[PDB]
Design a binder for these strands. Sequence first.
RNA 1: AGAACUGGCGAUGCGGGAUGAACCGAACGUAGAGUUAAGGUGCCGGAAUACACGCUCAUCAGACACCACAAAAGGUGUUAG
RNA 2: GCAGUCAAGCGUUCAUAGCGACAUUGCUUUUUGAUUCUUCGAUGUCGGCUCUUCCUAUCAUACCGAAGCAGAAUUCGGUAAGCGUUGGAUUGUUCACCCACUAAUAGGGAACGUGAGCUGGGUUUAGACCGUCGUGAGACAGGUUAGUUUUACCCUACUGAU
Lengths: 129, 188, 49
Amino acid sequence: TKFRISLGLPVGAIMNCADNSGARNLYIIAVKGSGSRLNRLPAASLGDMVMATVKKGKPELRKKVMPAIVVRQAKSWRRRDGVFLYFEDNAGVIANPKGEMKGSAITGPVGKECADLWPRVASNSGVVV
Amino acid sequence: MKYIQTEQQIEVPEGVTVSIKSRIVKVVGPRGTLTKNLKHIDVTFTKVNNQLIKVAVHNGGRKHVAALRTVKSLVDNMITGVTKGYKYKMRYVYAHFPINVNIVEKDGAKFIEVRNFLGDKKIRNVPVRDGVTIEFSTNVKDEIVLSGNSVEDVSQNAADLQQICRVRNKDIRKFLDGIYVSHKGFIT
Amino acid sequence: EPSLKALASKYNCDKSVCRKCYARLPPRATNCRKRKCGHTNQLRPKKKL
RNA sequence: AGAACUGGCGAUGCGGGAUGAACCGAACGUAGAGUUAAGGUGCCGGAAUACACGCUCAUCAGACACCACAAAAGGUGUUAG
RNA sequence: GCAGUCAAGCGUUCAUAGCGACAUUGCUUUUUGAUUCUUCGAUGUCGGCUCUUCCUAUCAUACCGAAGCAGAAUUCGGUAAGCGUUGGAUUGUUCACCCACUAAUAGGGAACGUGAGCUGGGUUUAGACCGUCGUGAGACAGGUUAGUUUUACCCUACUGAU
Ligand SMILES: [Cl-]
Ligand SMILES: [Mg+2]
Ligand SMILES: [Mg+2]
Ligand SMILES: [Mg+2]
Ligand SMILES: [Mg+2]
Ligand SMILES: [Mg+2]
Ligand SMILES: [Mg+2]
Ligand SMILES: [Mg+2]
Ligand SMILES: [Mg+2]
Ligand SMILES: [Mg+2]
Ligand SMILES: [Mg+2]
Ligand SMILES: [Mg+2]
Ligand SMILES: [Mg+2]
Ligand SMILES: [Zn+2]
């Protein structure tokens, strides 16, 4: 499970691609496990699995829907130790619905909450916060 | 069709004393005493001798007469309860998970506990009604015996134990697991 | 356990089913005890496994 | 929507149908007394919580013409044949 | 539009688990017609937005019955409206069709709820263009573009306040 993290990536947000799968950015279209409310946009945070389409990248990666996992968040959130922290930008990696990464390497830091939830992200990550 | 008169006979054994007044019935026997309130039938009790008692209905319809025979049966069950007693026997039925049944004392209430029914972690507790004694019979595998003077108390207590072990979300024709009554009889 | 299986069968299998309201009924009943179907006499045995 | 015979409303109040142009009773000067119509007589409400033989118990009873709805098909509910 | 009765048949065998021909009895007023009673000294008119409440013929959630219910999944039925029933691409659209999430994305009423609440894209004044029709003026439930949305201080209702 994951303790609640402030949402900063509603549907339509474009985040950088952090792995070496060939994609350069991710276009979020949906968030897994999201609720329902009139007029409310589904939003994602660190560690959430989303549905994304590649807008800029290799031609074989574009024009289709694939799962993705957010690894960095520019919106500040509060940990249970009391500190408010945020990253320099928003980033994610391409994964299959089971959670295994399409690529094999991650560039840049990865949030601790995302690393705990996904063992595959932790193995392919270099620095955790 | 508003029958003029209908009667039933109640046989009183040698060792049993019956006191009836204002439809309050009390029976005294070697095994104990029983009481019953019957102020909902509108019948008339009359005594012939120390060995025979008659109960009658005057100018009663089909539905009213049908309850006259019920009153006779209830009083008869009271009489044989205090002279012979009732004994209900139940058997444990399971396929894979053994059923563990024990007697426990929770804040002086004398419950009976059921363990490991279909591998469930839930603890099943059934209260034991007053006047009912529970003993696990020997030389018979997975049998529990309930005894008492009141047939309703014994039968209802055994019924509560059977209903508490019902299978859910499964084909009950295949999952024949539970505790079922196997014999109804008398202590003597 | 042929003896114990038969004992459990009479409580779970040896039954009658009302055609109109699916109620579980005794094997030898001629009418359903439910008021929703008006005590209908259209009854069938419970299907065997 | 359109015809036939008669009675009505329109042109008409009054008692009754809770309420209503047409139904029921009855048609109208101003008053008194008596008797009734149709409809009613547990209380609202004037008048028997009258008498008599039965039937019915509904975990969506039933209750009065016009009139403000219910059917086919069923029930070892109960009653008579 | 929805629900029954009968049971020739389907269902490997077996009418009625689940379906069901030939016939036949109903219910509903969220379809469309039929009619012309009310309104032409005028009841503001399509859809959306916003917001409340109601109906159950129940999509999901609670508890159950039934199966051709081993398990898993699913199907049929009961008590139930307590609680929920969404985010988007195209279209003025109601409707429809896809993408995606979700326990589920159920159907309806309230003067076809709701314009002195909004909005004005559509329809339905006057400008203009095209096609077909007409000798012509002009016509088209055919297409296209541009086109003023007024007033509450009164009574009541409601929300708060003496
Ligand atoms: Cl012309
Ligand atoms: Mg005139
Ligand atoms: Mg009337
Ligand atoms: Mg009076
Ligand atoms: Mg006319
Ligand atoms: Mg006017
Ligand atoms: Mg006006
Ligand atoms: Mg108005
Ligand atoms: Mg309207
Ligand atoms: Mg306006
Ligand atoms: Mg208005
Ligand atoms: Mg316009
Ligand atoms: Mg114009
Ligand atoms: Zn039935």
